[PDB]
Design a protein around this ligand. Structure first.
Ligand SMILES: NC[C@@H]1O[C@H](O[C@H]2[C@@H](O)[C@H](O[C@@H]3[C@@H](O)[C@H](N)C[C@H](N)[C@H]3O[C@H]3O[C@H](CO)[C@@H](O)[C@H](O)[C@H]3N)O[C@@H]2CO)[C@H](N)[C@@H](O)[C@@H]1O
Ligand SMILES: [Mg+2]
Ligand SMILES: [Mg+2]
Ligand SMILES: [Mg+2]
Ligand SMILES: [Mg+2]
Ligand SMILES: [Mg+2]
Ligand SMILES: [Mg+2]
Ligand SMILES: [Mg+2]
Ligand SMILES: [Mg+2]
Ligand SMILES: [Mg+2]
Ligand SMILES: [Mg+2]
Ligand SMILES: [Mg+2]
Ligand SMILES: [Mg+2]
Ligand SMILES: [Mg+2]
Ligand SMILES: [Mg+2]
Ligand SMILES: [Mg+2]
Ligand SMILES: [Mg+2]
Ligand SMILES: [Mg+2]
Ligand SMILES: [Mg+2]
Ligand SMILES: [Mg+2]
Ligand SMILES: [Mg+2]
Ligand SMILES: [Mg+2]
Ligand SMILES: [Mg+2]
Ligand SMILES: [Mg+2]
Ligand SMILES: [Mg+2]
Ligand SMILES: [Mg+2]
Ligand SMILES: [Mg+2]
Ligand SMILES: [Mg+2]
Ligand SMILES: [Mg+2]
Ligand SMILES: [Mg+2]
Ligand SMILES: [Mg+2]
Ligand SMILES: [Mg+2]
Ligand SMILES: [Mg+2]
Ligand SMILES: [Mg+2]
Ligand SMILES: [Mg+2]
Ligand SMILES: [Mg+2]
Ligand SMILES: [Mg+2]
Ligand SMILES: [Mg+2]
Ligand SMILES: [Mg+2]
Ligand SMILES: [Mg+2]
Ligand SMILES: [Mg+2]
Ligand SMILES: [Mg+2]
Ligand SMILES: [Mg+2]
Ligand SMILES: [Mg+2]
Ligand SMILES: [Mg+2]
Ligand SMILES: [Mg+2]
Ligand SMILES: [Mg+2]
Ligand SMILES: [Mg+2]
Ligand SMILES: [Mg+2]
Ligand SMILES: [Mg+2]
Ligand SMILES: [Mg+2]
Ligand SMILES: [Mg+2]
Ligand SMILES: [Mg+2]
Ligand SMILES: [Mg+2]
Ligand SMILES: [Mg+2]
Ligand SMILES: [Mg+2]
Ligand SMILES: [Mg+2]
Ligand SMILES: [Mg+2]
Ligand SMILES: [Mg+2]
Ligand SMILES: [Mg+2]
Ligand SMILES: [Mg+2]
Ligand SMILES: [Mg+2]
Ligand SMILES: [Mg+2]
Ligand SMILES: [Mg+2]
Ligand SMILES: [Mg+2]
Ligand SMILES: [Mg+2]
Ligand SMILES: [Mg+2]
Ligand SMILES: [Mg+2]
Ligand SMILES: [Mg+2]
Ligand SMILES: [Mg+2]
Ligand SMILES: [Mg+2]
Ligand SMILES: [Mg+2]
Ligand SMILES: [Mg+2]
Ligand SMILES: [Mg+2]
Ligand SMILES: [Mg+2]
Ligand SMILES: [Mg+2]
Ligand SMILES: [Mg+2]
Ligand SMILES: [Mg+2]
Ligand SMILES: [Mg+2]
Ligand SMILES: [Mg+2]
Ligand SMILES: [Mg+2]
Ligand SMILES: [Mg+2]
Ligand SMILES: [Mg+2]
Ligand SMILES: [Mg+2]
Ligand SMILES: [Mg+2]
Ligand SMILES: [Mg+2]
Ligand SMILES: [Mg+2]
Ligand SMILES: [Mg+2]
Ligand SMILES: [Mg+2]
Ligand SMILES: [Mg+2]
Ligand SMILES: [Mg+2]
Ligand SMILES: [Mg+2]
Ligand SMILES: [Mg+2]
Ligand SMILES: [Mg+2]
Ligand SMILES: [Mg+2]
Ligand SMILES: [Mg+2]
Ligand SMILES: [Mg+2]
Ligand SMILES: [Mg+2]
Ligand SMILES: [Mg+2]
Ligand SMILES: [Mg+2]
Ligand SMILES: [Mg+2]
Ligand SMILES: [Mg+2]
Ligand SMILES: [Mg+2]
Ligand SMILES: [Mg+2]
Ligand SMILES: [Mg+2]
Ligand SMILES: [Mg+2]
Ligand SMILES: [Mg+2]
Ligand SMILES: [Mg+2]
Ligand SMILES: [Mg+2]
Ligand SMILES: [Mg+2]
Ligand SMILES: [Mg+2]
Ligand SMILES: [Mg+2]
Ligand SMILES: [Mg+2]
Ligand SMILES: [Mg+2]
Ligand SMILES: [Mg+2]
Ligand SMILES: [Mg+2]
Ligand SMILES: [Mg+2]
Ligand SMILES: [Mg+2]
Ligand SMILES: [Mg+2]
Ligand SMILES: [Mg+2]
Ligand SMILES: [Mg+2]
Ligand SMILES: [Mg+2]
Ligand SMILES: [Mg+2]
Ligand SMILES: [Mg+2]
Ligand SMILES: [Mg+2]
Ligand SMILES: [Mg+2]
Ligand SMILES: [Mg+2]
Ligand SMILES: [Mg+2]
Ligand SMILES: [Mg+2]
Ligand SMILES: [Mg+2]
Ligand SMILES: [Mg+2]
Ligand SMILES: [Mg+2]
Ligand SMILES: [Mg+2]
Lengths: 49, 272
RNA sequence: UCGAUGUCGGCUCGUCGCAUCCUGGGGCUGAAGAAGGUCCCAAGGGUUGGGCUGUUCGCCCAUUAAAGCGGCACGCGAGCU
RNA sequence: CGAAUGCCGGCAUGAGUAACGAUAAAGAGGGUGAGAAUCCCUCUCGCCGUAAGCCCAAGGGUUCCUACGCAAUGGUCGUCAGCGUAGGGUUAGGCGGGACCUAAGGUGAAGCCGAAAGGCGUAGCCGAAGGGCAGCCGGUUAAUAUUCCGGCCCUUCCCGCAGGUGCGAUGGGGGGACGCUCUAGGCUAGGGGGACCGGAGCCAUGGACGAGCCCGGCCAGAAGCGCAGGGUGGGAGGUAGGCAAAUCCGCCUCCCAACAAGCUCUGCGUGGUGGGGAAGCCCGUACGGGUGACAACCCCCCGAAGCCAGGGAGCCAAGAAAAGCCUCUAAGCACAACCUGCGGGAACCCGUACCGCAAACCGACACAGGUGGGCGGGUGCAAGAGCACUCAGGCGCGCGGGAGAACCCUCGCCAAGGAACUCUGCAAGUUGGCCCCGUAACUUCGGGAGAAGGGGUGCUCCCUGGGGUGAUGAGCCCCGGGGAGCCGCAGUGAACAGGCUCUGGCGACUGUUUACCAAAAACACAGCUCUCUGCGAACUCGUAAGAGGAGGUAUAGGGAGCGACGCUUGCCCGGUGCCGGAAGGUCAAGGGGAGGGGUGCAAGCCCCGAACCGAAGCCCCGGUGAACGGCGGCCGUAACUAUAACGGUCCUAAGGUAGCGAAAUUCCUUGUCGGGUAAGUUCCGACCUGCACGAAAAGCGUAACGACCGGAGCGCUGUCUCGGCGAGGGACCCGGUGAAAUUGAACUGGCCGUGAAGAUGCGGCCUACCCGUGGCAGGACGAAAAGACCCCGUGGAGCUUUACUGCAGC
RNA sequence: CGAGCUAGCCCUGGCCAGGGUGAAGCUGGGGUGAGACCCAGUGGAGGCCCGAACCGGUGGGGGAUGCAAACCCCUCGGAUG
RNA sequence: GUGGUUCGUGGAGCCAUGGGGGAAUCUGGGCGGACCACCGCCUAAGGCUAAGUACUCCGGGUGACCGAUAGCGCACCAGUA
RNA sequence: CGCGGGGUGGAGCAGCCUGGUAGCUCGUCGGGCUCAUAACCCGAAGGUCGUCGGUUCAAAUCCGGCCCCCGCAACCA
RNA sequence: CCGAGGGUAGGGCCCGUGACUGGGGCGAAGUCGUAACAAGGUAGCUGUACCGGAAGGUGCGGCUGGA
RNA sequence: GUGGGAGAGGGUGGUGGAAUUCCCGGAGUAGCGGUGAAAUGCGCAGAUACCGGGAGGAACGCCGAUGGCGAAGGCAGCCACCUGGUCCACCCGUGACGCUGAGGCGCGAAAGCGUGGGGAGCAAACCGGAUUAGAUACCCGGGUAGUCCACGCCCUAAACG
């Protein structure tokens, strides 16, 4: 039947986006750590135009 | 009135509709004086505070005039009488001679063509509005104010009305659609007559949908749910509560009074 | 046997015991004959179809030479229901 | 290190075993090649065709096209590929999105709130398949084209000229601007037909040179015309309203219009011109090219759900906003500016390949699953997007070849009987569309109804009645009627298409639900009743601000129960609750200080501390059951017995009314009668000794409704007696690829014993040459899950309350 | 950190072939003092009916190291709310 | 009414404080564990102030530290696949 | 089988737990009123306390065993 | 073609019968009470309504066949 | 026809006063209620009785009659509107147009029913207190439907002269 992953570019940047994470105190920390851990990608790689 | 139906479908037998004869060939509302976008929504910021709402026909707000000392002395002619989805009372639209249009909740009687007005002057006739003092003790009246300049608030439901009782200082005793004798200030307007369309209390919704149309989702009894989400809940084949009847949140609901005790509004009240 | 021995009944499949329901042999009979009663020998084969109940079991209906009692993890769910 | 169902890794066993992913289906000839069932080509066959064909959007991100390649990927093969290497390929003022607008919702200056973090928040801003907005038809590439090219037609800006007018805003007004159902008129898309027109060709096999077969008879298109249709009154006075001002809008009052007459505005025809243009045949493809061709390009008919569109009518549940646009004026400015025509110039950013019901998206897979929008031909079947076949187009599902066992799956048929099957007619059958006859109890007059039960259905000829489009006609297309007659077992001859009835239980009904074992009698539901709430409402969320309630106001809002409708819902307020009681009793901080104490030489300083004054709550006095609840026992009595209308007595707060009753309640119980049956623990009707019904956790009924549950009968049948044969997909054999859970090691027999009590492994005896293949499941206390029952642990969680102790809240 | 699955609500769009049944209301006639009302014809209502799409998921069978960590076949509920 | 200190209401001071009341300027005020007397010690309600102390992203040195299942998760283009 | 409640004049009930004293209502019997019956009025009688044991100075009463009576329980499998 | 009849399906009326149930009539000397006729010891009767073992009571309006 | 008369004849709207019950203020105490007698009940939480004020419902004293009006059921404070019946005088008009009346249709007390409203007094049922052998009755203290209004039903009667 229908599954749980229904990709959607908008929803994805809108939710796990970078400006998205900067906006909140908890998300900014999410960035810190990922930066502090090394992670090549701080946030998901949404795309297209 | 109240239209009836032959049983050509169970439900549309007991079903009963209003009679919109009193509706002056109007329907399409009046831009300008209303309508405004009406933000429908069953909960506040986030959560749902009143339960069981949502869904139900889209609606446009008819921005009515609920404080008439706006036009003291300026007479206006009642133009139409139309339907208002936001209330039980039908409403009348009227053109002042000032050239301004505005709606008023329509009183029983008021016919299209009639002239109506407000102010200390104003003749005591259906439609006219005046400060409570200047109104004849005993006359009935609707659309009362509670405090000078704050707008109408009592007897505005379909065909409801309040009767003046006496005077007493800068105050005048009323008798609200509920039976409470209240002391209102003299300077509160109150347009004379009863609200009209009193057949409203007689409409037999009819089916399940009918309720759904007016935006009210099904209502489930506490008795149906479990202990986890309401007092009356569990365990075997139904049950008799098992304790003093209570609400989802738990306070008694078969008798417990609510008005907050030490309210300042107490002293101006006298009844039930 | 609880780091699992699936549990009632039914179905299918059997197989075994004899403390034998039938058929075979026999003694006594309050056995004239016919039909019984009762005990002894005997398990080779046989031991029906239905109504009701999940039923085992029963109680019926219609028959039969008879419509036997038990065991096999209340035989049989890596065979079925 | 030998064990931890240990951790990582490696390699075994099962095993050449199961599988190889829809039963839509393949056969051949010729290519290429080291190597072809699998790649290319041609012929034949088959499958899809409201798709398994096209066109968008999302998602994906080079998969596109081409050349060279097969180690791996491909469930086999592979010369092939969506795979490897390389190169190429995506072109916009008019398509979509942005230098436009607003929606929910975000964000948020002002402001408000919060220990901090932060939370709110009218303006504004952001926010879109919603509003607005200027491109149609062809042609070209191996791959892009509404983007390039051709033809034709538009839009903004900026600068000029030419002419008009008081021009002029984020401000005023108008407009934009709106539901559902049903719809008329005229068009278009699309489709059918043609004795007419245009075309290579073709007369086969008995006949046909014929108004024969086969193929095709269009596309776009400015202005102007025409045909539909949408919008809209025109004056003049007066004005105090549209938060300043308006000449605008609104409201009065007189005129002329009421008509679309007129203005505009779309749509459809026609249009200068521009393009396309079959079969067949010839070619070389991996495909397209050429000819047919000076191609013809005409006449009828059906016709939308699309267009005119803001069309119309009806109904209640009463149906976004803002901009563009029009208009109005304000500051300012009127040598500005704006409007109209005409030129010239300027016109940016991002997307554009390909897949896209799927091998490229979501499912670890080239996965029988899931995925929004538009087009979706013809014929027949009453209709249709149904069904059968078939255009265009696309496929034969990336292992094959044989065989013709058991068994399985899916399918087909069957003598006689037919429910004897079985928990159950589970399953399967019977029935089936349309037309016409004809239909009961009951009933809320609608219904029950497709009740039931019947007959008709093909083809041919004759006569004949209505329309529709054309003129009042031919044709073409729809509906009908009457009469003769033909052929088969059979005419909705294939496909799609209720078995019916009787009677109970529950629930009124349509709905809803345990996504992934329960679809129900459960939830919901209209409706009934109780209770709270006067509005800064009650209530809910929130520390607050705040919001919801509600831009509501007692005919309203919250909470509780009951649950259409009919007839009804008795008695108990003693206990619990809630409601009402300016009296009393108790009662905390606080007030009050009689009196006492500690130190001081003392003035003092510091402590206790009785009266008495002290809330709510509790106590106490009352009320209240559609509030939590409750609604008896033992004896005796009638002129046959029997039973008890009658009585006595004990105790309750009162001692279950009506109605119903062996029940979805009945233990004893298959109660006892009666009905159905040859036979009935079920079923139906009764009786009442109701273990342990009973009136809004409603009581007793109730037409209609039900994938609910029980009982019966008719019809029909492989359910059964009681099996049999047949079909295909597996199973089996051959070639190719090749798993798995499991596994202390094994050289792994029966019996009677024995052993921790159920032995291949111990004893005794019996049997037994070594190794496989298809089969059956009795066993290895067989595999699978550290038993989900039970107990245990001073293990854990969810839940309850007059358990304890707190907290919110009041 | 999550409502890209699922649940509800808010905003904005879209979809529902073709058949039945025939409510009100109209119009005509009948009726009356006026009515009620009764006949036709018209009309096109409805959590109405048959039935695709679509949304489901009743019974059975298959599947059960599956095509699939919910599938397939026949059958079946709703389908203008 | 609470927090701090060893101090859990204790005979409970001291130091901080949300609440109420509410002074004095050297003959003024606080403290020495309830309180009072005496004897003493300090001078609240403003602020700043090196050093000695902590840490190891980074550089260097040394190891009765490891030696590719060890040692950092990574000796290898790893916070990668 | 288990649990706990009950047997008292003719009938229904008290009386015990803090042992010594059996009470109420009805009925029964005698008398009265009435023409008579009942009602009513006046007087009277009536209990081995279910039984076998002992506990005490003394048992309806307290403690054991049977005898019937009633009410409850019988779950997880 | 019609057609006696036979078959099948569904209705209409009537008769018979049935566990059990409802009230009725009748049947010398069973039980309970006293409703009515005297002012019947609550004047009676009445339509209706609720209640009670029973006669019956009570509400509302009515009647003289009572005062 | 003309011109007059009486009337609680009917429907609608409005209005007045007496009394009851409740609430508020006052003042005031030790009992009030009730009956054959009582008790239940109410009252120091301040009753009864008395004065002041307010709310609400229903019924209209005197006039009133043995009277009037209507077809009956039935109809009563007062005012206005709409409206029916009817008697007299005058003998002007029509000119036999008449009587009854199966059926139909309308109306029809009280109680009862539906929907909504209202509810002071009263009051089935019901609860108490007495009475009695018992009382599911009479008597007493409470008390709900109903009694009142609107609309729609029901169609009965000692609807009796
Ligand atoms: N014929 C009387 C009708 O039935 C009823 O009356 C019946 C009963 O009331 C009556 O019963 C009476 C009883 O009332 C009276 N107090 C005692 C008497 N012994 C009984 O008598 C009855 O039984 C006996 C014996 O069996 C018979 O012989 C006698 O005929 C019979 N009436 O017996 C009657 C039947 O026979 C109605 N009350 C009466 O109004 C009605 O009209
Ligand atoms: Mg607007
Ligand atoms: Mg919130
Ligand atoms: Mg938020
Ligand atoms: Mg509910
Ligand atoms: Mg539940
Ligand atoms: Mg709870
Ligand atoms: Mg409960
Ligand atoms: Mg229960
Ligand atoms: Mg075990
Ligand atoms: Mg094991
Ligand atoms: Mg023997
Ligand atoms: Mg013998
Ligand atoms: Mg055996
Ligand atoms: Mg056994
Ligand atoms: Mg057994
Ligand atoms: Mg067994
Ligand atoms: Mg099994
Ligand atoms: Mg096994
Ligand atoms: Mg070891
Ligand atoms: Mg391993
Ligand atoms: Mg094998
Ligand atoms: Mg094999
Ligand atoms: Mg195989
Ligand atoms: Mg395959
Ligand atoms: Mg085909
Ligand atoms: Mg690639
Ligand atoms: Mg390719
Ligand atoms: Mg190649
Ligand atoms: Mg391969
Ligand atoms: Mg594969
Ligand atoms: Mg090659
Ligand atoms: Mg490639
Ligand atoms: Mg923008
Ligand atoms: Mg730019
Ligand atoms: Mg905002
Ligand atoms: Mg914010
Ligand atoms: Mg914006
Ligand atoms: Mg947009
Ligand atoms: Mg565009
Ligand atoms: Mg392409
Ligand atoms: Mg201008
Ligand atoms: Mg403007
Ligand atoms: Mg505007
Ligand atoms: Mg020939
Ligand atoms: Mg054209
Ligand atoms: Mg102005
Ligand atoms: Mg060509
Ligand atoms: Mg319109
Ligand atoms: Mg704007
Ligand atoms: Mg492109
Ligand atoms: Mg493309
Ligand atoms: Mg699609
Ligand atoms: Mg494949
Ligand atoms: Mg797929
Ligand atoms: Mg889909
Ligand atoms: Mg089509
Ligand atoms: Mg068809
Ligand atoms: Mg199809
Ligand atoms: Mg057969
Ligand atoms: Mg046959
Ligand atoms: Mg048969
Ligand atoms: Mg059977
Ligand atoms: Mg059998
Ligand atoms: Mg059955
Ligand atoms: Mg079946
Ligand atoms: Mg049924
Ligand atoms: Mg049934
Ligand atoms: Mg249901
Ligand atoms: Mg569901
Ligand atoms: Mg489920
Ligand atoms: Mg269902
Ligand atoms: Mg299910
Ligand atoms: Mg608010
Ligand atoms: Mg609001
Ligand atoms: Mg409510
Ligand atoms: Mg319920
Ligand atoms: Mg229910
Ligand atoms: Mg009750
Ligand atoms: Mg009580
Ligand atoms: Mg009480
Ligand atoms: Mg109480
Ligand atoms: Mg209280
Ligand atoms: Mg107090
Ligand atoms: Mg019974
Ligand atoms: Mg029971
Ligand atoms: Mg029988
Ligand atoms: Mg049977
Ligand atoms: Mg029987
Ligand atoms: Mg019950
Ligand atoms: Mg109840
Ligand atoms: Mg119920
Ligand atoms: Mg349903
Ligand atoms: Mg078979
Ligand atoms: Mg086969
Ligand atoms: Mg092989
Ligand atoms: Mg052994
Ligand atoms: Mg050995
Ligand atoms: Mg051995
Ligand atoms: Mg085995
Ligand atoms: Mg095992
Ligand atoms: Mg364990
Ligand atoms: Mg258990
Ligand atoms: Mg413990
Ligand atoms: Mg009609
Ligand atoms: Mg219809
Ligand atoms: Mg429907
Ligand atoms: Mg359907
Ligand atoms: Mg402390
Ligand atoms: Mg010190
Ligand atoms: Mg000291
Ligand atoms: Mg010091
Ligand atoms: Mg100082
Ligand atoms: Mg410092
Ligand atoms: Mg080393
Ligand atoms: Mg390592
Ligand atoms: Mg090594
Ligand atoms: Mg590592
Ligand atoms: Mg009969
Ligand atoms: Mg008498
Ligand atoms: Mg009497
Ligand atoms: Mg009497
Ligand atoms: Mg009476
Ligand atoms: Mg009575
Ligand atoms: Mg004359
Ligand atoms: Mg007459
Ligand atoms: Mg009447
Ligand atoms: Mg009445
Ligand atoms: Mg109602
Ligand atoms: Mg009274
Ligand atoms: Mg007496
Ligand atoms: Mg009384
Ligand atoms: Mg009379």
């Amino acid at each position: 039947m229908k599954r749980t992953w229904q990709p959607n570019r908008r929803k994805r940047a809108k939710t796990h986006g970078f400006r998205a994470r900067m906006r909140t105190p908890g998300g900014r920390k999410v960035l810190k750590r990922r930066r502090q851990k090394g992670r090549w990608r701080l946030t998901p790689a949404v795309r297209k135009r | 009135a109240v239209k009836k139906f032959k049983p050509y479908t169970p439900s549309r037998r007991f079903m009963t509709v209003a009679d919109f004869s009193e509706i002056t060939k109007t329907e399409p509302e009046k831009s300008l004086v209303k309508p405004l976008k009406k933000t429908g929504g069953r909960n506040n910021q986030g959560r749902i505070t009143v339960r069981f709402r949502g869904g139900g026909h889209k609606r446009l707000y008819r921005i009515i005039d609920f404080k008439r000392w706006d036009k003291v002395g300026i007479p206006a002619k009642v133009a139409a009488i139309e339907y208002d989805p936001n209330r039980s009372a039908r409403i009348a639209l009227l053109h002042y001679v000032d050239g301004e249009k505005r709606y008023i909740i329509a009183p029983d009687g008021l016919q299209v063509g009639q002239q109506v007005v407000a102010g200390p002057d104003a003749p005591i006739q259906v439609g006219n509005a005046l400060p409570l003092r200047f109104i004849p003790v005993g006359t009935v009246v609707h659309a009362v104010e509670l405090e000078p300049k704050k707008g109408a608030k009592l007897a505005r439901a379909a065909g409801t009305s309040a009767q003046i009782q006496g005077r007493e200082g800068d105050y005048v005793i009323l008798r609200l659609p509920s039976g409470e004798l209240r002391k209102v200030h003299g300077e509160c307007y109150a347009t004379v007559g009863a609200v009209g369309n009193a057949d409203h209390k007689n409409i037999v919704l009819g089916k399940a949908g009918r309720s759904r149309w007016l935006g009210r989702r099904p209502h489930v009894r506490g008795a149906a749910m479990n202990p986890v989400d309401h007092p009356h809940g569990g365990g075997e084949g139904r049950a008799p509560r098992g304790r003093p009847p209570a609400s989802p949140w738990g306070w008694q609901t078969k008798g417990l009074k609510t008005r907050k005790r030490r309210k300042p509004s107490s002293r101006f009240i006298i009844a039930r």
